Amino acid sequence: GDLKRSLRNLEQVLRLLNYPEEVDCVGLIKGDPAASLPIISYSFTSYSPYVTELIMESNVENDLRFIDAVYKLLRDQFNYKPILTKKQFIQCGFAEWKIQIVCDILNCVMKKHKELSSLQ
């Protein structure tokens, strides 16, 4: 857990994703899930038309179900198992690890888009 490293990884990843919204810096540092969910949500709904078509085809979304759906999506479609459990993510703490999971999810979305746009 290195807060500075994780935040710098997120800045670089948000830059590559062209995330257009303002980021809740205070919430991320405090490990608040509410600061991570809008970023993950944006990458699923608004980043790529190919990634978003795949996601909207299976599951549909108060975000207690949102965390469960994201975990199932990452396991099935992106072959990603987050480091924290579903309850370690919903509870406050492990801030550096939640930040890196956002970076990982966003890297999965972007590598999935590059792969899907290729075979078209």
Numbering used by the authors: 4 to 64, 69 to 127
What do the paper's sentences say?
CEP192 and CEP44 are proteins with a key role in centrosome and centriole biogenesis.
CEP44 was recently identified as a luminal centriolar protein that binds to the A-microtubules (MTs) of centrioles, as well as to the inner centriole protein POC1B20. The crystal structure of the CEP44 CH domain showed a typical CH fold consisting of a central four helical bundle elaborated with three short helices. The comparison of the experimental with the AF2 predicted structure (AF-Q9C0F1-F1-model_v1) revealed 116 residues superposed with rmsd of 0.74 Å. In contrast, the CEP44 experimental structure superposed with related CH domains with rmsd ranging from 2.8 to 3.1 Å. Mutation of the residues that constitute this patch abolish the CEP44 microtubule and centriole association, rationalising their involvement in microtubule binding. Besides the accurate prediction of the CEP44 N-terminal domain, the AF2 prediction of the alternating coiled coil and unstructured regions that follow the CH domain is in good agreement with other prediction methods and provides an easily accessible model of CEP44’s overall domain organisation.
